[PDB]
């Protein structure tokens, strides 16, 4: 898959994941993520056109909404020009939790 050549206009995505096993998401601050050259956007549950319910038994989120339920729960996704820029931007997504 990654050996396939990139389209000239291709963007890179980097997942942003929970660092707490169970906790409410109090707030998300993308302010540092936007300063990263190449940053396009930060995707969250709100950007889902239709259903945020996925998984084989419909019990999983596409993106975390209100609470995270494992360390590594996917909260959002940074989009940027390059993977280096997507990773750096992803580090500039500061999340506040309440366990």
């Amino acid at each position: 898959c990654d050996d396939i050549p990139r389209y000239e206009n291709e963007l890179s995505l980097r997942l942003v994941t929970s660092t707490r096993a169970h906790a409410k998401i109090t707030s998300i601050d993308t302010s540092e993520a936007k300063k990263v050259p190449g940053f396009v956007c930060f995707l969250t549950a709100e950007d889902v056109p239709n259903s945020n319910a996925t998984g084989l038994f419909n019990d999983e989120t596409v993106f975390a909404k209100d609470e995270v339920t494992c360390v590594g729960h996917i909260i959002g996704a940074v989009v940027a020009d390059t993977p280096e820029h997507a990773q750096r931007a992803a580090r500039g997504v500061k999340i506040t939790y309440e366990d």
Partner: peptide, 9 residues
């Protein structure tokens, strides 16, 4: 969203 190809490995 972007109308652009996107990739993640």
């Amino acid at each position: 969203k972007t109308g652009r190809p996107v990739r993640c490995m």
